[PDB]
Design a protein around this ligand. Structure first.
Ligand code: GEN
Ligand code: GEN
Lengths: 9, 235, 235, 9
């Protein structure tokens, strides 16, 4: 979830 | 505010936000090819999602949720769309055109390839247009995870209502497109229904595909592609 | 021929074919209660299917296929319909009204109870009518397994086309109902879309429910109810 | 499938 969260931010 | 967009402004915007075209780069080898492509596409899917009218109005937590819930269905609808013009084939990438029998390289894969081919054949006979395609893909993003949002928070409830209104607009947009396409009111209702019912099939294929990917993952035949593993885990 | 029925003849017929009301009669005990009820309901579902306009025009093999593909989704939509008037509760049977926490008796069940409750709350706020409900249930029966029909036979292809036309009629019927309900053309398109998109959620809950039932079955906590076991196996 | 088949017939 950390990568998804990063890319979305 | 997406709720202001007109039908044409909606479609034109969706069409301009389409992700770029990517090229792909035994049972393990086959699984590696598909999962590697999906991982790379996911990066572009996230960028695309940000441009879907209404998506960024949601809390980061809700954006994450929608993508976690619909990612495979979105990759799959894009795949059936690309495969339209290639009867009996699945165009994963410009340099990866696979026939049905290619699915036999992996236990349990021909089943899902057949469902994918069936949907593609369906969109072909229906002569699905790109304007319609992008609306459908956005609907999947917004609709899949909205009912899994928490119901234990006023803010979550407002988030659900907002998504539902944006979904209503996309519905008006689809009707609009069929209207100018010369369809009668009856043909419009019928076509809109056919399209939405197909989305149900896509959700089914996606669920089946997910179970398949997890089972392979367990057989340790899935490369360690971090983003793909993140999305898979969310299910 | 179902294709001749008028909108009102369609709805009235569907309403008259509704199955009769049945009463239900630890983790194992909970699973026993639900599976026992489903097994008994399946007998009546088969009788009901025969009366769905167009179902009996299909080959016995295709009738079997549709029911194998949609049975759980049909039990579930009937459950959310019955639970409409009972906020936060699931009315499995007149004598079996279960709260959310009741789902904690079984590992992994609260998750699906929450999705079911969510859908019920959704139908409530939308004020779904019984005329609409029966159309939706018939659509599920016809739509779920149609794209899994063989594509390697002329007869199968004609069977798919026939189902698609009957589905078109049901679409006209739903529009008709919303029309006389005083809805504008825009509200009609929007409501029809909302309903069909919910069907997608139901397919998801059904898939999740099926995986749950198979996992319990494997834990040998599912009684030997022959018809239920037959339907489960078909998945 | 035999029960389903029977009931449908
Ligand atoms: O179809 C896919 C895809 C896939 C890849 C790129 C796309 O554009 C669409 C689907 C990825 O991983 C899988 C993994 C599986 O186990 C089974 C599958 O059918 C797939
Ligand atoms: O909801 C159900 C039902 C069920 C029973 C009667 C109905 O009318 C609807 C669903 C049956 O078996 C299950 C078995 C499960 O493992 C999990 C479930 O949620 C269910």
């Amino acid at each position: 979830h950390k990568i998804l969260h990063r890319l979305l931010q | 505010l997406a709720l202001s967009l007109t039908a044409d402004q909606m479609v034109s915007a969706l069409l301009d936000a389409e992700p770029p075209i990517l090229y792909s780069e035994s049972e393990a080898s086959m699984m590696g090819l598909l999962t590697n492509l999906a991982d790379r596409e996911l990066v572009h899917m996230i960028n695309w999602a940000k441009r879907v009218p209404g998506f960024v109005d949601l809390t980061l937590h809700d954006q994450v949720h929608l993508l976690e819930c619909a990612w495979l269905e979105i990759l799959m609808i894009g795949l059936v769309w690309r495969s339209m013009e290639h009867p009996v084939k699945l165009l994963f990438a410009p340099n990866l055109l696979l026939d049905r029998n290619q699915g036999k390289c992996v236990e349990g894969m021909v089943e899902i390839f057949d469902m994918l081919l069936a949907t593609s054949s369906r969109f072909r006979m229906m002569n699905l247009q790109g304007e319609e395609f992008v609306c459908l893909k956005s609907i999947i993003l917004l609709n899949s995870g909205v009912y899994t949002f928490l119901s234990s928070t006023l803010k979550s409830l407002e988030e659900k209502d907002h998504i539902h209104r944006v979904l209503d607009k996309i519905t008006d947009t689809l009707i609009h497109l069929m209207a100018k396409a010369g369809l009668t009111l009856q043909q419009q209702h019928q076509r809109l229904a056919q399209l939405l019912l197909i989305l149900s099939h896509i959700r089914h294929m996606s669920n089946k595909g997910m179970e398949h990917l997890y089972s392979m993952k367990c057989k340790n035949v899935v490369p360690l592609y971090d983003l793909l593993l993140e999305m898979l885990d969310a299910h």
